UniProtKB/Swiss-Prot annotation:
Its main location: secreted. This is Leptin. Disulfide bonds join 96-146. InterPro entries: 4_helix_cytokine-like_core, Leptin. The lineage of its organism: Eukaryota, Metazoa, Chordata, Craniata, Vertebrata. Adipose tissue is the main source of leptin. It is also produced by other peripheral tissues such as the skeletal muscle. Expressed by intercalated and striated tracts of submandibular and parotid salivary gland intralobular ducts. Detected by fundic epithelium of the gastric mucosa. Secreted into blood and gastric juice. GO terms for molecular function: DNA binding; hormone activity; leptin receptor binding; peptide hormone receptor binding. Belongs to the leptin family. Pfam families: Leptin. It comes from Homo sapiens. Keywords: Diabetes mellitus, Disease variant, Disulfide bond, Obesity, Secreted, Signal. It is found in: Secreted. GO terms for cellular component: cytosol; extracellular region; extracellular space.
Amino acid sequence: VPIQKVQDDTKTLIKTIVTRINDISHTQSVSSKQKVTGLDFIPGLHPILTLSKMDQTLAVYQQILTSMPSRNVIQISNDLENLRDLLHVLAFSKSCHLPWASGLETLDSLGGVLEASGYSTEVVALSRLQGSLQDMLWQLDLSPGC
């Protein structure tokens, strides 16, 4: 299938996945209930990553999301797979072949980004995962390399 068909489903998927984050992110008021965020900071930056890094970002976030006994963020973990599915078929139409991320490749190489500083609240993982998802969409119009 053409890249444009893959992107059509990826555009709506990312925009729909982020809606679940936004729905529980509606309570991230200024110093109201956004407590236990480790140190009131966002060490999960939103830089320019490639299709290979995009799949890996969802794989490594799953290793932190598993530690979150909150149906709100767990139901979202299954929706991340749907983005990655198209992402693998996307690079195929670009003559590029990316490796399927296992999950447990950089659990510790990334776990230090958060320091596990009371990372048990939804707002925290959601504040990181929110733009992490949208950070795959704009990227398809920037530089979706492999």
